[PDB]
């Protein structure tokens, strides 16, 4: 026939890919970082507890001034905290209480939001009327909206559970670029620090690296065995870390095109909900289903602490832009700020 | 107090935000959500439109019954986003009862009944749904009584039913074949029902079942069990 010939061509291309990836794996990250001294043990104590949510917290994001937060929850609200003094700046009532993502613009003006309603709401905080109006409602996806990350004050890239990502134009409202190629849902997104590339982790046991200027998939990374609930770049944009559901984080590398490490412990049997590196890249925090985060040494896999202060599953967390804090958020409607 | 004027005014604004949050969380603590997930081919539209005339994304229908507010979250019908539909009291299933002898369109081999029962298995046997009290309607009972006195059923399924020419026999057979799918289902009973040609008793029955569920759940926080 003809379809089987193209399938054989695809199979031999995948074999060429596997041989090219195997030809470069001369050493590992363990056989090289086995001489530097470990980090020791890292005690982190809760510094603040931010109360006021009345339901499960599903996402959060840090401002780029390292002080202001934002937190979405199934209460139906979107609160903007002041993390230094624990008081609330704004509280935004959502039109649909089924919210599963959150963002915070890199300039501080706007705030994005999204959920099961298939739309991405852009809110304008610095109005001259003293309110927080819905500045835009971006529609055009066909499945639930899992993550959204601001790029400029005019462009936003987001990922939905209809096997697509999309780069929008907040002024007009139309999809500038659509990103296709996955097979299952898409539940995670992370932008490179230079904001020309980004990576997503699908419900397909795969991650992909797109470039927002062209609209094509550069590379794809396999190796997991379950969903990929989270993703995050390395602070220099040449590696990322996925957090799966089979109780294992990993560390891929965009130039070696392979997998480097495998952060997994035998006590751990529950899936990761959120990973986030540190400022220098020597830690890898990972919130788990068993109610507590971890702190993985990201050059030798040796676990180096535990942030156990929650009493329910910990949702997305985030390390500040200047480095001074971590901020987890869990299903008991409490944020915490470790340090 | 070591706070300046703007700091004290910001703390006052925060306390006012907190008061408004507490009020909106009092208004939504006496709210009863009822998820609605049928089987597609089971006349969901007919029940929905009759409930709408008597009173892309996810849908939602607000109403009130006997001074209690109900939300009906009709999801537009997978893995990890049904874990937000916990703390949603009394999921409300819905099946067409007269669909025991037809066969699916895209699959001309398997029966529609076993497919609906497998959906029921995957939904009830979830772990996060171990605090929600499944209701179970069966529409088109008049279709069932029309199509039960003309055909037999022992030739369809191998499970023992008995005589094929009545109503109560096939009804108890259907309720047993649907109920038997659970696995150690305590603290969440299965209020089966039987909805004929459409009427006004449906929402009264749903209110009775949700009242029973909230009673059995208040009867454990008070240690009064």
């Amino acid at each position: 026939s003809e379809l089987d010939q193209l399938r054989q061509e695809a199979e031999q291309l995948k074999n060429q890919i596997r041989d090219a990836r195997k030809a470069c794996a001369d050493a590992t990250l363990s056989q090289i970082t086995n001489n530097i001294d470990p980090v020791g043990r890292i005690q982190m104590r809760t510094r603040r507890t931010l109360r006021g949510h009345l339901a499960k917290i599903y996402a959060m994001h840090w401002g780029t001034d390292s002080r202001l937060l934002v937190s979405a929850s199934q209460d139906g609200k979107l609160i903007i905290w002041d993390s230094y003094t624990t008081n609330k700046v704004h509280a935004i009532p959502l039109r649909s209480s089924w919210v599963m993502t959150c963002a915070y613009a890199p300039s501080g003006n706007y705030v994005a939001c999204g959920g099961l309603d298939n739309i991405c709401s852009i809110y304008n905080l610095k109005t001259r009327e003293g309110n927080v109006r819905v500045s835009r409602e971006l529609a055009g996806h066909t499945g639930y909206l899992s993550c959204c990350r601001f790029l400029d004050d005019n462009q936003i890239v987001t990922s939905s559970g209809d096997t697509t990502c999309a780069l929008w134009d907040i002024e007009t409202g139309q999809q500038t670029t659509t990103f296709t190629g996955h097979t299952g849902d898409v539940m995670s997104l992370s932008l490179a620090p230079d904001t020309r590339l980004f990576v997503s982790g699908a419900c397909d046991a795969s991650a992909k690296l797109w470039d927002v200027r062209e609209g094509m998939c550069r590379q794809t990374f396999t190796g997991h065995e379950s969903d990929i609930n989270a993703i995050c770049f390395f602070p220099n944009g040449n590696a990322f870390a996925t957090g799966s559901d089979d109780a294992t984080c990993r560390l891929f590398d965009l130039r070696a095109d392979q997998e480097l490490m495998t952060y997994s412990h035998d006590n751990i049997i529950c899936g990761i909900t959120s990973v986030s590196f540190s400022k220098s890249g020597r830690l890898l925090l990972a919130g788990y289903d068993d109610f507590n985060c971890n702190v993985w040494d990201a050059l030798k896999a040796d676990r180096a602490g535990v942030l156990a202060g929650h009493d329910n599953r910990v949702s997305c967390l985030g390390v500040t832009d200047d480095g001074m804090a971590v901020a987890t958020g869990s299903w008991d409607s409490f944020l915490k700020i470790w340090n | 107090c070591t706070l300046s004027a703007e700091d004290k005014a910001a703390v006052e604004r925060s306390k006012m935000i907190d008061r408004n949050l507490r009020e909106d969380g009092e208004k939504a603590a006496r709210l009863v959500k009822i998820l609605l997930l049928g089987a597609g081919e089971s006349g969901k539209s007919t029940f929905l439109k009759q409930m709408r005339i008597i009173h892309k994304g996810i849908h939602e229908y607000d109403f009130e019954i006997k001074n209690v507010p109900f939300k009906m979250v009709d999801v537009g019908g997978r893995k990890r986003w049904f874990e937000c539909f916990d703390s949603v009291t009394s999921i409300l299933f819905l099946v067409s009862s007269s669909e025991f002898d037809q066969v699916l369109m895209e699959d001309r081999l398997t029966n529609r009944l076993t497919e609906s029962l497998n959906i029921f298995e995957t939904i009830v046997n979830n772990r996060v749904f171990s605090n929600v009290s499944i209701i179970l309607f069966l529409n088109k009972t008049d279709l069932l009584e029309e199509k039960v006195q003309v055909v037999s059923i022992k030739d369809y399924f191998l499970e023992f039913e008995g005589d094929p020419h009545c109503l109560r026999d096939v009804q108890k057979f259907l309720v047993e074949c649907f109920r038997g799918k659970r696995r150690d289902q305590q603290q969440k009973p299965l209020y089966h029902h039987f909805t004929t040609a459409i009427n006004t008793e449906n929402i009264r029955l749903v209110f009775r079942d949700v009242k029973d569920t909230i009673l059995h759940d208040n009867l454990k926080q008070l240690m009064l069990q």
Partner: single-chain antibody
């Protein structure tokens, strides 16, 4: 955004009045409101402040007990009940909105004011001069010296700068000594630290002539300055 006031006119001494302030165009329910008087030729002076709900209320030490500020949210109005009108109360009265959170810009929008004529601890802030001659195209400077250190322990000085054009209502120009207000062209800069503050202007225009006032916001009463006149 619009504030407009009413209730002026000639008053007999020893009487009583009520001033009204209607606010159309913004969210009045979440905006603290100040009254600010102004003598015939003697510059601005704070009068009273009422909070965003109906909580903290403050008065100047010369109008405490006589006056009474109040607000009505569903009608979007603000009232000042003045009792025992003395001869030193003839003035033009302005409303001022101000919202307080992290990073806000209080004293946003001044109203238009009513004229009210009758028949017949405390931070002290001084201005440099009373009139300077300038030319359009020259970079100028205005100095305002406090008496207590306005640099609070959290790092932000609380000195503001307003500009009043001839025949108009003053507008916010600079808040917290460095931050520029909205709609202000990139020519005004704020500098200094501690108890010596400075506003520097680049090449000026025909719309930069007026009187410049420096406020403080550490503690009530908020004490304005004497004003420096920018004449051509």
């Amino acid at each position: 955004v619009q504030l407009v006031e009413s209730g002026g006119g000639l008053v007999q001494p020893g009487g009583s009045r009520k001033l009204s302030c209607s606010a159309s165009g913004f969210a009045f329910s979440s905006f603290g409101m100040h009254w600010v008087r102004q003598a015939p030729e003697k510059g601005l002076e704070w009068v009273a402040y009422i909070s965003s709900g109906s909580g903290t209320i403050y008065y100047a030490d010369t109008v405490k007990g006589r006056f009474t500020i109040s607000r009505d949210d569903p009608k979007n109005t603000l009232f000042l009940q003045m009792t025992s009108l003395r001869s030193e109360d003839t003035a033009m009265y302005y409303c001022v909105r101000s919202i307080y959170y992290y990073g806000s810009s209080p004293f946003d929008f001044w109203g238009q004011g009513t004229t009210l004529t009758v028949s017949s601890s405390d931070i002290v802030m001084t201005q440099a001069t009373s009139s300077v001659p300038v030319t359009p195209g020259e970079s100028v400077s205005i100095s305002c010296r406090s008496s207590k250190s306005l640099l609070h322990s959290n790092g932000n000085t609380y000195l503001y700068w307003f500009l009043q054009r001839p025949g108009q209502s003053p507008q916010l120009l600079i808040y917290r000594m460095s931050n520029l207000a909205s709609g202000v062209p990139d020519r005004f800069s704020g500098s200094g630290s501690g108890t010596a503050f400075t506003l520097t202007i680049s090449r000026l225009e025909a719309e930069d002539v007026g009187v410049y006032y420096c406020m403080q916001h550490l503690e009530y009463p908020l004490t304005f300055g004497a004003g420096t006149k920018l004449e051509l």
